């Protein structure tokens, strides 16, 4: 359903990580 | 908690007879229980 | 006049299920076993008879075997609503499951547990008197189903044999499928059901799946809705025997006028009108619109395509409001028709019948209560068509030898195996030979 | 009737013993206290499965504890539903095994093996007919693996005729626990695949990558993990407990997944999984939970199934759902990924519907595919232990101990016919 | 053959009142499991806030 | 199963799909030979002399 | 005696829902189907208290038809009966032909038997639809093709809607049009076209209706089928079936292309004003200020005439009538018919319908010819067809589709193939 | 049932797209919560045009926003109706193009593609037939062009058979906001030349003296435009979620405006566009609809027609309105000035009719019309092009990137005969 490069390792990356933990910061006060 | 076989199968509401059925009139009076000789008079005639 | 119905499996005794609670429906028996008027109150009936026996006084317990090696459906039949109407003693439920393996049904559990089946059967043949034949509902893919239900065929075949053994076995969809061996399973049963079986009926699953689907336009049907046709489709088999009709036909006959040769006995069922209330009154329904609808592959309960083969000899069972005039009309009009083709060495392939009492309706059920229906039971070459088609599916398996080493762990050999295998390619030759003019 | 009997070795295997443990009792009705407070009689007809019952209306869990420090029997009676397992059961040693799989199937297996192999036999003939063991550890560490290992050896000799299954977390070079993970890793599963019918690999990362993207946790500790494995664990095992339309028990599903004997390594997953914040914006429909069935970021091991081929799958529904939408639904996933799937077995889909959902959601869904991607799992491994074999590092303190050079050449020659034939049937 | 056909047809008009109330029952409960649903998104939520 | 498909499978039940097509009955769809609707059938002789 | 009705298209079946409306209350027939003989032509009775009529709409797309279905009619026609494909054919005759009919012709042919099979003294087939749409033309092709290799024999009355000159609303219509007569010269027996134009000049002028919209040209429309059927389904001093116009109009296995007409159009007030009789309308069926095709029958021949009556008529001022046309000379018949008229009475007078512009009149005409007219409105079509193949504009989209450039030069030249029939016969 | 699914790329196709799902949303009724509250049951029957049920009368859009800063997913959060959408759909880079193409189309793209491609496909097969795609970006910035022009690249090697909608800005040198305007809008029309099936042209300087001179607006913030925009766009679509008379789908109109492969670029008006002092002395005639509709100062784009020829134009309809005073008005229209049409086509006019309006309006009119005159924009922009290629400015920050100068070869030689073949059939 989804054709892409594997990427599960994406997250092993601190930076990834922390931009990730923005964008649920971001959802959920929007959300508030 | 609801299984579907459950949930599916419930007690029939009302059921009534068919209103055809085969009727064993050969078996109902042709063969009588036990009596070889009957009192005089049973049945007029 | 009296039948007896075994059921095997997963799939066989739910199917029961369903069809006892449509017989008691049918002869007013409530789910505790007694009818609301007692025997001698009531005007004297006997078409109960012939499926469940009057025990005592008020209480009336079914003609029927349930077995199954797990548990788990057969007690929750225990807990169920039927309680008190299925004997006790004749569900038989075993401790493990046979998992889908004919060899672990047919060799490791049957051993112990088809002595205690045919024990049963045996007193309830004593307790019946002027028994007709058996019936016996299985699906071949499943292990219990096979295994096991094969075994006490054979047992069965051994202990009377003379006696007519209907089978309604659900063979595998081509295209669905939920197990993964059922070609194994189904070859390996199908080689006992060849020269044991009489009468042997398939139900498919897809065909089912299309016909609640298109005709009865439920957009999400379970196994449910599946096993209610199929008791109704039972019931009408059988209203013969029950009922008194204006052209009445029993067991033996579809031994007689169906089936031309020893080997050659694989029906094809359907049922007409499949239709839903909401529509009902907009349809006008007659007999000559239902003698074609028991025609068309769109009612059919096998996925096949009979265009593409020749008949043999067909059955058609009517009940309900049906005069022989214009049945006699309407089996004048489908002989005149050209898009189907009877075989040329048959002149007459009808087996009419008429039964005078209706269908019947269940609560919560999807069918509308109609004038009258149809149950054809045919025969023709799109069968042998389906076993060619299973038969290439087994042998693309068998070719890498996979899943071999389960059966050969259980005891089984690859002997069976090719045998079954040139069984069925014989059997297939059969099948084109006849269809030969 | 069918009897399961629980062995949970290591650390890892303890605390994920835990956590299913409390997801069990929950989805029963038992209090931590041991009581049942459930309110349907469906979860009294079939907790014989799992329990002991006990005076009182207590149901006492059928479980072995086996591991060598206290520090996990403290860890495992501090929480919840800990006061419930039997003190007899806690079978432990005193001095620790410490990653060393010599130490774990040599040294103290030779003093602990007999006492845990007294205890499951007690068990096993506390019941009546068994239906198979369920054993839970990893392949890294030493009192887990060197111990469950010989256990699974010991219990394979004893009764060969009962099914086994064996939740199993491998290790990854991104997931590096500890130095020797090859080294133990090959050992245990140079074992495990003639003793033990099926096993059903676990990674870490896969389940860091389900609970950051699925779930979006943003502190995904131990727990949550560990609550995973048990959903799945107690998924695969629903269809004992409770009726269903279409019944599936522990060998039915053997023999369709397992085609040939040594191809006995399963994938796991599970559905829903889905982030709080958009389980308002979702359906729940049989397309719906099979479109995230079929995902391949929701495989729990990091084996990406386009690239590699599917010998076989399976999928577990619990609830009402309509049958006909189950068929057509794996019917679609074989029909336009035709490729992927292997091409001689036709019908490649094993399916089973449970009447009975778990609870807080209202349908769910465990998916097994037995691939033939893991393949590169085990390379993946074999080519950390030729890399450490080529020059023998921290080899001795395995040589000193009794175990010899040979072991290791037996063990990587037979990961490499594993590889072999993985490869030769793709 | 009328009295047969009226019969029948006043069966089926029972049974199509029967069918809607089914209907309506079914629809119903489908309601009530959303509602539990929401319920437990929301306790969810409030546990995250904790 | 017929999700983005315009054939007959799809249409079959009212636009909702059909597991596999059906031949009819009623006509020959695919070949030109079709059914003749009407066919002279011989009556009774007796009917007319 | 019965005869069934399909509607392809989406015009088809917004013409059936206004015959259908004006058909029950024709016979009395509430919208939920039951009265509070005569009605079996059209409808067969289901048991009791209900009918459904024997019709048959097909579309390939949606709306309009489940318009229909959740409209004021749901309890009359058959749920089956309603027939709506997936996505529509987007005016283009390849599309409809090939992509979409290959999997709605199948359905529809095994429903269309059924409902013959359900008939007893089937008379015919008769279809509606407008060649210049996609759906409409393409599978219209494909069913009547299959229809006629079906049955053959029996009468398929065409009532098409053809594309006015300069009055239009689409683009590709002329590709359509000469793909669509390709088949429907052969296939058809019976053919009528009709413009809107002419209609719209009706109802602007007789009926003064300033702003009208499609509905009212259906109800028109509709008035015309039920005057034209009502000899079957009504008796009458003189009554005409199907089977005479396949005769009594058609010289030429070829010539089968019917102009109507249709008077007298009047409405509520001026009526009341004016004096009906026979003479009259007899002479206002004549003037291209009544005809339901835009065209000039003055510079055309009559082949042959046919006039159906309602109401209150007699044979002696028809009679009377009809002569006095042909002693006139301001129309002129074709030499080769001395004897070019064929008309028929039945005392049933045209109804009226609640939300119709028309009163109730004492008796009414419809007029059917045939005449040379209509061979210079094809010739008229075709120059406007060849204007835009000539640079191979939209065949792009066509042979994209499956089609080529065979198709469009043998449609092309049978169309000159017709021209010179209609000259010749002409002469 | 017909299936339209959404796409926004770039700053301005998401606040495009903000004001769009705002109209629709209020069209069809339902609050900023999701939940149904209108009293017209039409509503309903097309719903699945363009929305999901999820969960108990929860409707959420069947769009995908795409972009490279997260300010512009702040700001469509931040509105009403911004809740509305699935979080799963907000697929999302984190560095940013940055007005360059090569970034959107070679390096961003390559990790981004990636992903939408994904939720895009699952949303395609999510609905049963689709009718086709619609994109709306913008062709100024590189977030928009580059990105979106691969996003259509993939999509039409995948799913060729459906229908594609893409609204596009295109620059002006009067209202001139970056720089790089014709480096970026020859290379993004270079492939929607081949790749996408139809375009509808739009430009800010028409959308500017609209408001000035017609609603004679004192402060036109970019709201009112992106209003005027969504107002067309819910024209267009109208036909789809609504019953009429006469009805014209999407490849229906396309089919009927396309009469050669590469002539598919069209352009836009609307009415009644009537300033509210002057809403009280206008009449409601389809005459008064024409004049303000065939107006060349009501055209949203710079390209005056009465300086080209019409080759076909098209009138979408709502309101109850007479049909035949609709198509005498086209005829009067064709017969007056037949100068401004193409002569080797007859009946240049395809019209439709809706019987419902949009709301707050009685009767409402929609113009999409393709014309030759579109070939002075591309002139007007193709001439700096080469201007700017001449002296190769800012040409590196795309050679360094990637890219070569035979694409900027072959995006000048099929603008240019395209102009030419316009310029023939002129
Ligand atoms: N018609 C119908 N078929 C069913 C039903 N349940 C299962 N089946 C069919 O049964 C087949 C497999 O056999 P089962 O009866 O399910 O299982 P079994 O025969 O008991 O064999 P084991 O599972 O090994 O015990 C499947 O392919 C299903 O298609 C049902 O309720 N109705
Ligand atoms: N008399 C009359 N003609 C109509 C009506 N509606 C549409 N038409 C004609 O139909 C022609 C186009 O065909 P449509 O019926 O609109 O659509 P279609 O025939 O299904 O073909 P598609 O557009 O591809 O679906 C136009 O030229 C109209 O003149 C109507 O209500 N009354
Ligand atoms: N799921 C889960 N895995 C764990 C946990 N703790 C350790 N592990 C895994 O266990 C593996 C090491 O096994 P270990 O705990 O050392 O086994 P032991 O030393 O024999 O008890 C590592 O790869 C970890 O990923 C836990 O709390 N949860
Ligand atoms: N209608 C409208 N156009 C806009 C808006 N913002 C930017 N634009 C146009 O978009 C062009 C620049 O595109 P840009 O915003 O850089 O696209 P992006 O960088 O890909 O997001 C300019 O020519 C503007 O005219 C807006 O809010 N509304
Ligand atoms: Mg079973
Ligand atoms: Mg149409």
């Given at each position: 359903?989804?054709?892409?490069?594997?990427?599960?390792?994406?997250?092993?990356?601190?930076?990834?990580?922390?931009?990730?933990?923005?964008?649920?910061?971001?959802?959920?006060?929007?959300?508030? | 908690?609801?299984?579907?076989?459950?949930?599916?199968?419930?007690?029939?509401?009302?059921?009534?007879?068919?209103?055809?059925?085969?009727?064993?009139?050969?078996?109902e009076?042709?063969?009588?229980?036990?009596?070889?000789?009957?009192?005089?008079?049973?049945?007029?005639? | 006049?009296?039948?007896?119905?075994?059921?095997?499996?997963?799939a066989?005794?739910?199917?029961?299920?369903?069809?006892?609670?449509?017989?008691c429906?049918?002869?007013?028996?409530?789910?505790?076993?007694?009818?609301?008027?007692?025997?001698?109150?009531?005007?004297?009936?006997?078409?109960?008879?012939?499926?469940?026996?009057?025990?005592?006084?008020?209480?009336?317990?079914?003609?029927?075997?349930?077995?199954?090696?797990?548990?788990?459906?057969?007690?929750?039949?225990?807990?169920?609503?039927?309680?008190?109407?299925?004997?006790?003693?004749?569900?038989?439920?075993?401790?493990?499951?046979?998992?889908?393996?004919?060899?672990?049904?047919?060799?490791?559990?049957?051993?112990?547990?088809?002595?205690?089946?045919?024990?049963?059967?045996?007193?309830?043949?004593?307790?019946?008197?002027?028994?007709?034949?058996?019936?016996?509902?299985?699906?071949?893919?499943?292990?219990?189903?096979?295994?096991?239900?094969?075994?006490?065929?054979?047992?069965?075949?051994?202990?009377?044999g003379?006696?007519?053994?209907?089978?309604?076995?659900?063979?595998?969809?081509?295209?669905?499928?939920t197990?993964?061996?059922?070609?194994?399973?189904?070859?390996?049963?199908?080689?006992?059901?060849?020269?044991?079986?009489?009468?042997?009926?398939?139900?498919?699953?897809?065909?089912?799946?299309?016909?609640?689907?298109?005709?009865?336009?439920?957009?999400?049907?379970?196994?449910?809705?599946?096993?209610?046709?199929?008791?109704?489709?039972?019931?009408?088999?059988?209203?013969?025997?029950?009922?008194?009709?204006?052209?009445?036909?029993?067991?033996?006959?579809?031994?007689?006028?169906?089936?031309?040769?020893?080997?050659?006995?694989?029906?094809?069922?359907?049922?007409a009108?499949?239709?839903?209330?909401?529509?009902?009154?907009?349809?006008?329904?007659?007999?000559?619109?239902?003698?074609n609808?028991?025609?068309?592959?769109?009612?059919?309960?096998?996925?096949?395509?009979?265009?593409?083969?020749?008949?043999?000899?067909?059955?058609?069972?009517?009940?309900?409001?049906?005069?022989?005039?214009?049945?006699?009309?309407?089996?004048?009009?489908?002989?005149?028709?050209?898009?189907?083709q009877?075989?040329?060495?048959?002149?007459?392939?009808?087996?009419?019948?008429?039964?005078?009492?209706?269908?019947?309706?269940?609560?919560?059920?999807?069918?509308?209560?109609?004038?009258?229906?149809?149950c054809?039971?045919?025969?023709?070459?799109?069968?042998?068509?389906?076993?060619?088609?299973?038969?290439?599916?087994?042998?693309?398996?068998?070719?890498?030898?996979?899943?071999?080493?389960?059966?050969?762990?259980?005891?089984?050999?690859?002997?069976?195996?090719?045998e079954?295998?040139?069984?069925?390619?014989?059997?297939?030759?059969?099948?084109?030979?006849?269809?030969?003019? | 009737?069918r009897?399961?009997?629980?062995?949970?070795?290591?650390?890892?295997?303890?605390?994920?013993?835990?956590?299913?443990?409390?997801?069990?009792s929950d989805?029963?009705?038992?209090?931590?206290?041991?009581?049942?407070?459930?309110?349907?009689?469906?979860?009294?007809?079939?907790?014989?499965?799992?329990?002991?019952?006990?005076?009182?209306?207590?149901?006492?869990?059928?479980?072995?504890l086996?591991?060598?420090?206290?520090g996990?029997?403290?860890?495992?009676?501090?929480?919840?539903?800990?006061?419930?397992?039997?003190?007899?059961?806690?079978?432990?040693?005193?001095?620790?095994?410490?990653?060393?799989?010599?130490?774990?199937?040599?040294?103290?297996g030779?003093?602990?093996?007999?006492?845990?192999?007294?205890?499951?036999?007690?068990?096993?003939?506390?019941?009546?007919?068994?239906?198979?063991?369920?054993?839970?550890?990893?392949?890294?560490?030493?009192?887990?693996?060197?111990?469950?290992?010989?256990?699974?050896?010991?219990?394979?000799?004893?009764?060969?005729?009962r099914?086994?299954?064996?939740?199993?977390?491998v290790?990854?070079?991104?997931?590096?626990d500890?130095?020797?993970?090859?080294?133990?890793?090959?050992?245990?599963?140079?074992?495990?695949?003639?003793?033990?019918?099926?096993?059903?690999?676990?990674?870490?990362?896969?389940?860091?990558d389900?609970?950051?993207?699925?779930?979006?946790?943003?502190?995904?500790?131990?727990?949550?993990?560990?609550?995973?494995?048990?959903?799945?664990?107690?998924?695969?095992?629903?269809?004992?407990?409770?009726?269903?339309?279409?019944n599936?028990d522990?060998?039915?599903?053997?023999?369709?997944?397992?085609?040939?004997?040594?191809?006995?390594?399963?994938?796991?997953?599970?559905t829903?999984?889905?982030?709080?914040?958009?389980?308002?914006?979702?359906?729940?429909?049989?397309?719906?939970?099979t479109?995230?069935?079929?995902?391949?970021?929701?495989?729990?091991?990091?084996?990406?199934?386009?690239?590699?081929?599917?010998?076989?799958?399976?999928?577990?529904?619990?609830?009402?759902?309509?049958?006909?939408?189950?068929?057509?639904?794996?019917?679609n996933?074989?029909?336009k990924?035709?490729?992927?799937?292997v091409?001689?077995?036709?019908?490649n889909?094993?399916?089973?519907?449970?009447?009975?959902?778990?609870?807080?959601?209202?349908?769910?869904?465990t998916?097994?595919?037995?691939?033939?991607?893991?393949?590169?799992?085990?390379?993946?491994?074999?080519?950390?232990?030729?890399?450490?074999?080529?020059?023998?590092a921290?080899?001795?303190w395995?040589?000193?101990?009794?175990?010899?050079?040979?072991?290791?050449?037996?063990?990587?020659?037979?990961?490499?016919?594993?590889?072999?034939?993985?490869?030769?049937?793709? | 053959?009328?009295?047969?056909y009226?019969?029948?047809?006043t069966?089926?008009?029972?049974?199509?009142?029967?069918?809607?109330?089914?209907?309506?029952?079914?629809?119903?409960?489908?309601?009530?499991?959303?509602?539990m649903?929401?319920?437990?998104?929301?306790?969810?939520?409030?546990?995250?806030?904790? | 199963?017929?999700?983005?498909?315009?054939?007959?499978?799809?249409?079959?039940?009212?636009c909702?799909?059909?597991?596999?097509?059906?031949?009819?009955?009623?006509?020959?769809?695919?070949?030109?030979?079709?059914?003749?609707?009407?066919?002279?059938?011989?009556?009774?002789?007796?009917?007319?002399?």
């Open positions: 359903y989804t054709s892409d490069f594997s990427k599960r390792d994406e997250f092993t990356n601190t930076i990834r990580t922390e931009q990730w933990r923005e964008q649920l910061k971001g959802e959920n006060t929007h959300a508030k | 908690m609801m299984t579907t076989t459950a949930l599916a199968f419930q007690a029939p509401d009302e059921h009534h007879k068919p209103e055809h059925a085969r009727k064993p009139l050969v078996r009076t042709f063969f009588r229980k036990t009596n070889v000789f009957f009192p005089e008079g049973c049945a007029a005639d | 006049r009296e039948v007896i119905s075994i059921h095997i499996g997963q066989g005794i739910q199917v029961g299920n369903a069809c006892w609670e449509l017989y429906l049918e002869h007013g028996i409530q789910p505790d076993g007694q009818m609301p008027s007692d025997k001698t109150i009531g005007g004297g009936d006997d078409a109960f008879n012939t499926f469940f026996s009057e025990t005592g006084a008020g209480k009336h317990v079914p003609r029927c075997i349930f077995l199954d090696l797990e548990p788990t459906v057969v007690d929750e039949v225990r807990t169920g609503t039927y309680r008190q109407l299925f004997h006790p003693e004749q569900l038989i439920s075993g401790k493990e499951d046979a998992a889908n393996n004919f060899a672990r049904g047919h060799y490791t559990i049957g051993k112990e547990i088809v002595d205690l089946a045919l024990d049963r059967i045996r007193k309830l043949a004593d307790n019946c008197t002027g028994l007709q034949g058996f019936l016996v509902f299985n699906a071949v893919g499943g292990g219990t189903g096979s295994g096991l239900g094969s075994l006490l065929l054979e047992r069965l075949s051994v202990d009377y003379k006696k007519s053994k209907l089978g309604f076995t659900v063979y595998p969809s081509p295209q669905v499928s197990a993964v061996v059922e070609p194994y399973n189904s070859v390996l049963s199908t080689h006992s059901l060849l020269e044991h079986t009489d009468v042997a009926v398939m139900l498919d699953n897809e065909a089912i799946y299309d016909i609640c689907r298109r005709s009865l336009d439920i957009e999400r049907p379970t196994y449910t809705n599946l096993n209610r046709l199929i008791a109704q489709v039972i019931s009408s088999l059988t209203a013969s025997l029950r009922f008194d009709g204006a052209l009445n036909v029993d067991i033996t006959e579809f031994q007689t006028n169906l089936v031309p040769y020893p080997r050659i006995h694989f029906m094809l069922s359907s049922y009108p499949i239709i839903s209330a909401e529509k009902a009154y907009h349809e006008q329904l007659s007999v000559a619109e239902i003698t609808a028991a025609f068309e592959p769109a009612s059919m309960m096998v996925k096949c395509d009979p265009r593409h083969g020749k008949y043999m000899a067909c059955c058609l069972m009517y009940r309900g409001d049906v005069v022989p005039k214009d049945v006699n009309a309407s089996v004048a009009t489908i002989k005149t028709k050209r898009t189907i009877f075989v040329d060495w048959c002149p007459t392939g009808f087996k009419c019948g008429i039964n005078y009492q209706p269908p019947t309706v269940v609560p919560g059920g999807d069918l509308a209560k109609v004038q009258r229906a149809v054809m039971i045919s025969n023709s070459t799109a069968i042998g068509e389906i076993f060619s088609r299973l038969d290439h599916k087994f042998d693309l398996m068998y070719a890498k030898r996979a899943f071999v080493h389960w059966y050969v762990g259980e005891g089984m050999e690859e002997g069976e195996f090719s079954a295998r040139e069984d069925l390619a014989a059997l297939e030759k059969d099948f084109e030979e006849v269809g030969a003019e | 009737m009897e399961i009997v629980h062995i949970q070795g290591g650390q890892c295997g303890n605390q994920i013993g835990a956590k299913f443990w409390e997801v069990v989805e029963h009705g038992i209090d931590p206290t041991g009581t049942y407070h459930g309110d349907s009689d469906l979860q009294l007809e079939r907790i014989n499965v799992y329990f002991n019952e006990a005076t009182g209306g207590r149901y006492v869990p059928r479980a072995i086996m591991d060598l420090e206290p996990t029997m403290d860890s495992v009676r501090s929480g919840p539903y800990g006061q419930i397992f039997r003190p007899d059961n806690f079978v432990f040693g005193q001095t620790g095994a410490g990653n060393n799989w010599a130490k774990g199937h040599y040294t103290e030779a003093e602990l093996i007999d006492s845990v192999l007294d205890v499951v036999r007690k068990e096993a003939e506390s019941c009546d007919c068994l239906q198979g063991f369920q054993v839970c550890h990893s392949l890294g560490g030493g009192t887990g693996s060197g111990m469950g290992t010989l256990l699974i050896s010991k219990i394979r000799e004893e009764y060969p005729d099914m086994m299954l064996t939740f199993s977390v290790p990854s070079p991104k997931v590096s500890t130095v020797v993970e090859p080294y133990n890793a090959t050992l245990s599963v140079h074992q495990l695949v003639e003793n033990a019918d099926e096993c059903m690999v676990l990674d870490n990362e896969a389940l860091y389900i609970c950051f993207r699925t779930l979006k946790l943003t502190t995904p500790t131990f727990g949550d993990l560990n609550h995973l494995i048990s959903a799945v664990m107690s998924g695969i095992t629903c269809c004992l407990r409770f009726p269903g339309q279409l599936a522990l060998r039915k599903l053997a023999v369709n997944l397992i085609p040939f004997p040594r191809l006995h390594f399963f994938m796991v997953g599970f829903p999984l889905t982030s709080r914040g958009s389980q308002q914006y979702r359906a729940l429909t049989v397309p719906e939970l479109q995230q069935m079929w995902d391949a970021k929701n495989m729990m091991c990091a084996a990406d199934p386009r690239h590699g081929r599917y010998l076989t799958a399976s999928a577990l529904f619990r609830g009402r759902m309509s049958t006909k939408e189950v068929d057509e639904q794996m019917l996933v074989q029909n990924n035709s490729s992927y799937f091409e001689w077995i036709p019908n889909v094993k399916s089973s519907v449970c009447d009975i959902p778990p609870k807080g959601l209202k349908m769910s869904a998916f097994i595919g037995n691939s033939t991607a893991i393949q590169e799992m085990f390379k993946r491994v074999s080519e950390q232990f030729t890399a450490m074999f080529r020059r023998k921290f080899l001795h395995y040589t000193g101990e009794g175990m010899d050079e040979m072991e290791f050449t037996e063990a990587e020659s037979n990961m490499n016919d594993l590889v072999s034939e993985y490869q030769q049937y793709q | 053959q009328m009295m047969l009226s019969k029948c047809v069966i089926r008009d029972a049974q199509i009142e029967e069918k809607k109330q089914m209907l309506a029952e079914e629809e119903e409960e489908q309601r009530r499991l959303d509602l649903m929401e319920i437990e998104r929301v306790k969810a939520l409030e546990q995250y806030e904790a | 199963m017929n999700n983005n498909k315009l054939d007959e499978a799809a249409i079959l039940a009212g909702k799909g059909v597991f596999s097509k059906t031949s009819y009955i009623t006509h020959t769809g695919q070949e030109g030979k079709a059914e003749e609707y009407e066919k002279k059938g011989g009556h009774r002789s007796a009917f007319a002399g």
